Amino acid sequence: NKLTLDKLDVKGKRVVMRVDFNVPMKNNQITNNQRIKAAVPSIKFCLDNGAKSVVLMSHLGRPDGVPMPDKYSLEPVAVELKSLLGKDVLFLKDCVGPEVEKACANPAAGSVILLENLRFHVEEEGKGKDASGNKVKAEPAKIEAFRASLSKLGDVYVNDAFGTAHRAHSSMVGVNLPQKAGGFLMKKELNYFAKALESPERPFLAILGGAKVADKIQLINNMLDKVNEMIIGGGMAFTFLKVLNNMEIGTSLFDEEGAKIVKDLMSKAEKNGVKITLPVDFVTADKFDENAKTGQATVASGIPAGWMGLDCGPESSKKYAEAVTRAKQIVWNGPVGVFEWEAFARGTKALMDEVVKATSRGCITIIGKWNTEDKVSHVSTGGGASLELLEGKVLPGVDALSNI
Numbered sequence: 373n374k375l376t377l378d379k380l381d382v383k384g385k386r387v388v389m390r391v392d393f394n395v396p397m398k399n400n401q402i403t404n405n406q407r408i409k410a411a412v413p414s415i416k417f418c419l420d421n422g423a424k425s426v427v428l429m430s431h432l433g434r435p436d437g438v439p440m441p442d443k444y445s446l447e448p449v450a451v452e453l454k455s456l457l458g459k460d461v462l463f464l465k466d467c468v469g470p471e472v473e474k475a476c477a478n479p480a481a482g483s484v485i486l487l488e489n490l491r492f493h494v495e496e497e498g499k500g501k502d503a504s505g506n507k508v509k510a511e512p513a514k515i516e517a518f519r520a521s522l523s524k525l526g527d528v529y530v531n532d533a534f535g536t537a538h539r540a541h542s543s544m545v546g547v548n549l550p551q552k553a554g555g556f557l558m559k560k561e562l563n564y565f566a567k568a569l570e571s572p573e574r575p576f577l578a579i580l581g582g583a584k585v586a587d588k589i590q591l592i593n594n595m596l597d598k599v600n601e602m603i604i605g606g607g608m609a610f611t612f613l614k615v616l617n618n619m620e621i622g623t624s625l626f627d628e629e630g631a632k633i634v635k636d637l638m639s640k641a642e643k644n645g646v647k648i649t650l651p652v653d654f655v656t657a658d659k660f661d662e663n664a665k666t667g668q669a670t671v672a673s674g675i676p677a678g679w680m681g682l683d684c685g686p687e688s689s690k691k692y693a694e695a696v697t698r699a700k701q702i703v704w705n706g707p708v709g710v711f712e713w714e715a716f717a718r719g720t721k722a723l724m725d726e727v728v729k730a731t732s733r734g735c736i737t738i739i740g741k742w743n744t745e746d747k748v749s750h751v752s753t754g755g756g757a758s759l760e761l762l763e764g765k766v767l768p769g770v771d772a773l774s775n776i
């Protein structure tokens with residue numbers, strides 16, 4: 373029970389809101405505006421309930437504590453947000469200090485202000501790199517001044533930046549105001565994850581894909597305490613199948629360090645009564661390339677020398693659909709093939725099709741140009757944060773919110 377924005381009285385108040393506007397950019401303009409979109413409901417709520425101002429703060433990229441306004445400025449985000457809000461956004465070329473404080477001290481009623489990239493200061497992350505690429509540490513008195521300056525910019529604080537909530541950064545745990553509320557995005561992410569983690573509908577299926585095994589050990593370990601079924605798919609599966617079945621895997625991804633714990637994970641699954649589904653067939657490629665020659669293989673055939681599996685095949689898609697069919701709650705993290713490449717996308721799109729059907733019949737479905745909004749219960753906006761939650765860790769940014 374943390375304070376949320378809907379329970380905060382903002383009438384006549386300056387709202388300082390941490391958002392996640394760390395959007396994809398191409399040299400350098402906005403390629404996907406979904407994170408910006410995702411914040412509008414909190415922003416409008418504030419303006420609709422009489423807030424005097426909304427001061428928005430975020431990072432963009434990894435400028436590493438160096439001001440990089442030619443490369444990583446938030447300026448284009450002000451223009452995009454104006455389009456999406458239907459309201460003027462003032463952009464400020466810094467995020468702390470006397471001119472910014474004065475600008476945010478008493479804005480005209482209803483003013484939306486977006487500050488420049490917080491990570492242009494080393495005090496946000498607390499560590500950074502210099503102009504030469506060497507590591508620098510922030511000084512405590514400077515971190516204190518930075519956090520104090522941010523704290524002046526609002527009367528109340530909102531954190532809607534679930535994508536950054538795993539970082540104990542100044543804008544996340546250092547704002548000292550009497551009320552610190554989660555935004556509606558934050559609320560939605562924590563509710564889908566708390567529900568799922570602590571009181572799952574059943575059966576609860578975890579679908580885990582991605583490339584490396586060793587970086588998902590704790591994820592799998594924690595999820596085996598919560599779930600009833602688990603598909604281990606995608607690039608990870610080859611390490612499992614090599615160890616458990618002595619499968620011939622070609623040049624498929626193999627994690628030497630993960631391989632040591634495969635059997636340990638399968639034991640924990642056997643100990644908690646979790647039914648594990650691995651793939652049984654593959655689309656193969658002659659090299660790691662979008663237009664590689666393709667082939668087909670099974671666990672029993674092996675993958676031929678020099679070839680790699682980049683997708684599951686049709687029999688796997690069936691077994692995966694059977695598990696999705698049985699589930700009343702699904703959490704999916706990581707794809708089941710190289711879905712950016714059409715030839716290796718069928719498995720992922722097929723599994724998505726199933727998850728969308730499941731949603732239609734009341735399955736709670738969580739995925740860690742498309743209106744994906746209508747089709748699944750929840751698409752998470754934060755990769756690393758949602759992983760850290762799935763691994764069973766506390767998020768500093770959530771823990772810092774006010775209780776009530």
Ligand SMILES: Cc1nc2cc(-c3ccc(Br)cc3)nn2c(C)c1CCC(=O)O
Nearest residue numbers: 583606607625660681682683708709710
């Ligand atoms: C960057 C990268 N990402 C992925 C992802 C996948 C991948 C993902 C799914 C499946 Br099924 C099979 C392979 N392979 N892969 C490789 C070989 C690379 C490059 C080399 C490596 O990091 O091992």
